[PDB]
User: Which sequence fits this backbone?
């Protein structure tokens, strides 16, 4: 029918398609017609995902995952994205579907994240047929989700006043120490900026952002806790009451 090279197409939707070859006269009437049925089925995609770390996960450590993608008989490059509860990675990452059948799913490397907060966290791995680089966003080939709990790290406070009863119009030294429920991992030093409000001024920051500004402001101090240590350095605020 032509001397041109073969033409390649990828079907957007699933179902049954009718590759149709037609012969047209001058009046665009069908003379001869040939139909080839193409079955576009997106099933048969297996997505495995699990967490490597098995001990009670803390917010200090980094939780890593092992993930893989497999198809029954299709060896075609797909795209994958990962969501840790905050959204999906903006560039879809290409995956080569070298292995098929039931031998071994193709693995996905460098899957890890650090969870700032605690509680129940879920990780969802999704695979799409087409890259989302452009306006094209192919059908979601498959998805999976694994949920787990992470124990948050709680902070306890020890407080004292250098004079136990601050004399009116006399300076008093508030001393503060911070205890961490879990020892900080080695190589990680924690610098926490703290702001204190005494009853002398009579006005306290009623807003969280105001407290943050006070901590980062002049009337705030910094407590440094060294790696592999529970306690913190003593923090001393001098305040005068009238």
Assistant:
């Amino acid at each position: 029918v032509s001397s041109a090279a073969a033409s390649t197409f990828r079907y957007t939707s699933t179902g049954s398609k009718n590759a149709r070859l037609r012969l047209y006269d001058g009046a665009n009437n069908v003379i001869a017609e040939k139909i080839v049925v193409i079955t576009v089925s997106n099933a048969g995609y297996t997505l495995a995902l699990a967490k490597t770390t098995a001990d009670p996960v803390t917010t200090d450590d980094t939780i890593a995952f092992s993930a893989g993608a497999k198809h029954l008989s299709s060896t075609s490059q797909v795209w994958w994205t990962i969501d840790y509860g905050a959204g999906e990675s903006s560039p879809r990452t290409a995956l080569t579907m070298t292995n098929v059948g039931a031998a071994a799913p193709n693995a996905i490397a460098s899957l890890s994240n650090q969870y700032t907060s605690g509680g129940t966290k879920l990780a969802t791995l999704r695979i799409y047929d087409r890259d989302g680089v452009g306006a094209n966003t192919g059908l979601l080939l498959a998805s999976t989700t694994v949920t787990f709990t992470v124990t948050p790290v709680l902070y306890a406070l020890e407080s004292a006043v250098e004079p136990f009863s601050p004399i009116a119009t006399v300076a008093a030294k508030w001393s503060f120490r911070i205890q961490r429920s879990k020892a900080t991992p080695a190589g990680v030093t924690e610098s926490i900026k703290c702001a204190f409000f005494g009853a002398d001024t009579g006005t306290a920051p009623a807003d969280l952002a105001a407290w943050l500004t006070a901590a980062n402001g002049a009337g705030g101090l910094t407590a440094t806790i060294l790696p592999s240590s529970i306690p913190s350095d003593i923090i001393s605020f001098t305040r005068t009451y009238a």
Summary: The first strand starts at residue 15 and ends at 24. The chain is about 5% helix and 45% strand. The two ends are 100 Å apart (CA to CA).
